[model samples]
Target: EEEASVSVWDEEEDGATFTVTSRQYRPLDPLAPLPPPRSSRRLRAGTLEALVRHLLDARTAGADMMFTPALLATHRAFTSTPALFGLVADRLEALESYPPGELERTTGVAISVLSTWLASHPEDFGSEVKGQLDRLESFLLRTGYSADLIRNLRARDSPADPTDVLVFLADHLAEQLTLLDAELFLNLIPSQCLGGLWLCPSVRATVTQFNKVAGAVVSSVLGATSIGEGPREVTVRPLRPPQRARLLEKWIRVAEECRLLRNFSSVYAVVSALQSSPIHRLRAAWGETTRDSLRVFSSLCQIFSRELLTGVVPYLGTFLKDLVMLDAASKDELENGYINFDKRRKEFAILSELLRLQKECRGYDLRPNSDIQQWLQGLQPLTEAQSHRVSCEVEP
Candidate 1:
């Protein structure tokens, strides 16, 4: 006859803690309990299957949550803030030599494949991020996964059972962050020619300087490094309203058109064609031209910030105060050990509204001008040496 041994410990407000041993085994010391038995809730097989389906739905919906909107917001913030953007870029560039396609292959999802998935299901992605955050909060309450417990589990690197719900949440959070980085690459490279310009020294120095400031801000806000620092690192920041609009106009005018050009070899072809008459023959060189272009873009973003502080900061401070009030009210509902579904739903609604408001507040109408051209011209002398090296690499 086969038998199982179980040691039951006192049940606390948190899940029960105990140890279990099989027939031939010795009686082990009491250990952390298995995750609250899924059986305890009296779920029938059909009910269990339904729960699994719900979780799957949450996963699918949350897939893009880390990318798209969140990434876009992050991109904007970093780009607009030179210090923060530069710091993050330094870290990311360091990872460039590691190997392209390695991360995607390891994750079993190519960047293109993930992009396609996100493009096809934008709403689902948004919902999924919300769902997962909600689910994690729920699990924390149900399993009594405290912050201390989470910290302890992370401190220990072991092959233990899944009692580490907090650690799991942490990992999930990190996965979302990684997805954000990937999304930036998708939006920037091939789209903005960032990868190539990132190799230029002037671009690299500017990126590094920007990242130094940007990283400190991000680390202060998020309590971690937002971007990696290294050789392959590329700085990606959001375009300020005016900056974005102007760049978008350029992108629409040039990039979109060039996509239709069958044999466009370098990004210069796109930028040059946009100008109609070549202002400078050297502009056709990829490294020099691209770096020059990025420098102008960077300056434009800076100009937007300066302009906004002068025109809008007075009104914006009050708007931010209102947001704080709204956030406080919503945060209170979840703080008092409440676990009702209605409360959860309301919390999500408030969160969504809060995000929407933040987005709207950043909105500003702006137009493109020849100023960007002048800015690019000013960058030529500073970047000449690096641009020369880059020019040599291009084919005749």
Candidate 2:
């Protein structure tokens, strides 16, 4: 019976062996020709004006739309500076004056260069330029962008909210004007004028008197026009003796406990050395550092913050915020454009110092906590919101 068992193929036990051949995908032709390059524009008087005018019109229409303190600073750098202003005015005229060919020759810019630059830098030529001019106008008004709007509203003296507008402008103006004055003094005094025989007593005295008078006149002129004040005198109000005493106490507390300043003492000597010495003399000023140096640095910030927030933060913060916003916006524009690469890169390098300072000091810490992790967490929702907004606006 066992021998006679039915013979059956054990297909399940033997199992089937299946072979799978995967088709290999050959790479696309590596040397395929790229899409035809865009046709280059030929520069001529008509084209130049059309392009330049397009840029001018852009600045005129919305220059004021992107107002910030840094824009104001750039405006001041131009306006308050006779040399810089003269240079800019001359450049503007130069830009407008000559025929495209003549202008190209004078500027050493080739027709192709002009055409390429104009094509590549529509934002700078069109929007940023206009925005810069608007900033100049706002700077002339002695107000931040927001304050400038309030001023216009008040000047209309609308019965609707006359006092509010006036008050808003007044308060805003007062907070910023002093810092503006200091910055003007620092910026306007030509280093050349402060140089040379002024090293002598008589020469020094004469130069001092002259500069004092010049500073006064400049300040008076700028303030009179901008803030409606006569005489450019700005007072420095140092902390009273008792207030200073209290500040010393707060400094210790803040330094010992504040997370940001806990390690500051380690850099205290470097900080002090840097502050007192000219920027050029920094490395030589404090050639070395130690653990104690950092501890002192932390203490210094705590002390400095105590005085700064109380004495100058309100005005300084406003001034700084303006610059920050303008700088950030300018950077965004630079990233988007190609024509101004060299110029933008140089400007960005200069601005990096300030950016570094902002990171070191808690000046721009608008976040709830200064903790990095917490700050990153806080940014998630903002990023998501921005992404959602962008997605919703995209065309199909």
Candidate 3:
């Protein structure tokens, strides 16, 4: 007797069709061993306690290799035994109140563990984990861990070559810009009554990321001036005239490279860093830059020119101004109570430009080198106080 069969098209046969007998379907064995479990409540309380102790000890001893794996284990244990979350929280809280130096070290370790766990297990972001993360971030902010993180990142070695450093900065800026919600930013009015764009949670977070990374870029430029001279340090002394000249030339070269890369954000950041009063105030340094380089810098600076009818602007300001004009034009067209195709076309024109820039940024796929990644992993978010200090120090 013939077994059951069905006909199916065969792509390899160039649209020809054939069939063979169909075998009986079999369900998976109910008793088959499942994939290895990620967690287990069967772990004794002592085992969990021992894991926690190991993590803390590793962190204190600066044994980062042990700390990471142990933290992973601890995360698994917490997931398996939810009861232990409270125990870890209590310990973290105690660390928050320790002396500033010790607090910075412990908080850095805790955040590292949390960041790695969350990044690795995105699918595990259930309410329990999210809630814990929220509590962790709040504690981090309250105890000023963010600022210490930036300080720590600055003390590390930067890329030696100008091109490599520019690549790193451009990649970093592009990554952050891709995270920004363009629609949300366009919809926001610039008036003070609405507390400006910074009031929006997403915008605030994006801007904070931008500022931190941009600040780091600026610091890196200054740091580059002192490279290979002696012990690595960010000296209080200003860049000497010759050092300033060399750094300024590097900045111009980096800006040009950024333009070629279509990374307007980093271009803007480099321009801002150069124009910061500390560097800008050096007249002799400005005179030393090649005339062609200065010309390129001058033209790029026009993008942020205050001469536009909309008033003073940054690189992003040009796009924002165009958006404002489109908004006003559309509102006037709305009074006719008819679908204004032209208005929509105009809106699309402006939005399309903004979208194009955003898309360009999103397309930037360069990953940081391993050294850069390690540095980034160790970086803490900057605190508000540290941010202010950077602004003052960079300019003042």
lDDT of each: 0.27, 0.27, 0.45
Please provide, for model 1 over 314-393, each residue's C-alpha lDDT reduced to its tens digit, 9 standing for 90 to 100.
11223334434543454322243322222223333433443443344244222333433222222211122322232232
Model 2: per-residue Cα lDDT over 314-368, one tens digit each? 1122223434454455432223232222222333333343334334443222222
The prediction achieving the highest lDDT against the true structure is 3
Q: Which candidate model has the greater TM-score, 2 or 3?
A: 3
| Candidate 3 residue lDDT tens string, 1-396 | 222333332121221111222233222554544432221111111233444443454333332243333334323312342334444555678777578987776666655654554444333345554454455557767876544433332232543332234445544434333323233333222221111111235334434544644554455444332222333333333555466566566666666665555545556766776776544655666776788878888877876533421201124545555656655555322242322333333444444444444444444444435654454333333333343343355445
**Poorest lDDT segment (10 consecutive residues) of candidate 2:** 189-198
lDDT of 1 at 267: 20
Candidate 1 — which residues are off by over 4 angstroms?
1-319, 330-336, 339-367, 372-396
TM-score of each: 0.18, 0.22, 0.37
Question: For model 2, what is the alpha-carbon lDDT of residue 133?
Answer: 42
- Cα RMSD, each candidate: 26.3, 26.7, 22.6
Clashes of 3: 2
